[PDB]
Amino acid sequence: KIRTLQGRVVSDKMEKSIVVAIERFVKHPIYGKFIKRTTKLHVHDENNECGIGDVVEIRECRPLSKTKSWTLVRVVEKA
Template sequence: MEKIRTLKGRVMSNKMQKSAVVAIERFVKHVVYGKFIKRTTKIHIHDEENECNVGDFIEIRESRPISKKKSWVLVRIIEKNNLINKITNK
């Protein structure tokens, strides 16, 4: 049996119903210069309860295709976005 792929990323958009867009960052080494470059991949995920918000750091796992673009599912929210708390100081 194959191991289920899991990734961690930051929520960029949650304007769709039961869906969100997550940005996955990775570092790749430049072939010629050897410098590590940050690359970002946007993945559409399925969020059944609409529980993740923009800026949350989440864990996702691969699943069967749910729609044309969605084949990843929300596993858990690792860290909530504290932007509102920083502005209101609460």
């Protein structure tokens, strides 16, 4: 298989690129409470199919621009 993250599209205003927010759920190292953390990745979106809100599906690839190193696999859910 291939490692794969899944997140939600928060920006699609670039040509062939999207910003995807990935949510993680981790235990706080001191206080033990489970908190939500977010990471925003720049993702390559050929065909420009994704819209702001869709739940997508991304994988890691070679660098494609200064900030892009991830590429869109599929759309899991459309907004």
